[PDB]
Amino acid sequence: SHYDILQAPVISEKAYSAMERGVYSFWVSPKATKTEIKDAIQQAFGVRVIGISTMNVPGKRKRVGRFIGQRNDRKKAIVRLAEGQSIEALAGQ
Template identity: 40%
Template sequence: MADIKYYDVILKPVVTEKTMNQMSEKKYTFLVHVDANKCMIKEAVQKMFAGVKVASVNTMNCAGKERRRGKDVGKTAATKKAIVKLTEDSADIEIFEGL
């Protein structure tokens, strides 16, 4: 886990109707590396986006789903989501501005 760089921690933003509504409360949702912990996620967000202060991080582990192709049964990859809450005096994250 020590060899994970901050730009490898955050994989992509999660853009859904629910996450767009949470942005008014300064909560942003990201898909993150499965081995990343809350401290790593907080540090990565503050380094990637200038002027951003993280108040709290909530994480969710999502298990892979079973999928079938004929008789063969496999699993999709497990994922991890993080909801990052910013402080009130923090700047907004710019990648969500045009959405």
């Protein structure tokens, strides 16, 4: 439900500075929709979301010994709020 969806947050130089801008970025759930993600974060973060984007990404097929395998493919999502409405739980990172 209004949580399950947000499978993680995104971690990198980029993500961090975007955060600094007031733009937050998570991995999500491939099957999901943008309306669904909006409803999601708007619900579990009490924020005004006015900006959104998503992008499905493959998964670095890697080998560990004679076992060529694909990783699970994710769906990076970016959201921009309004009026400097920074989110608390990640504001320390």
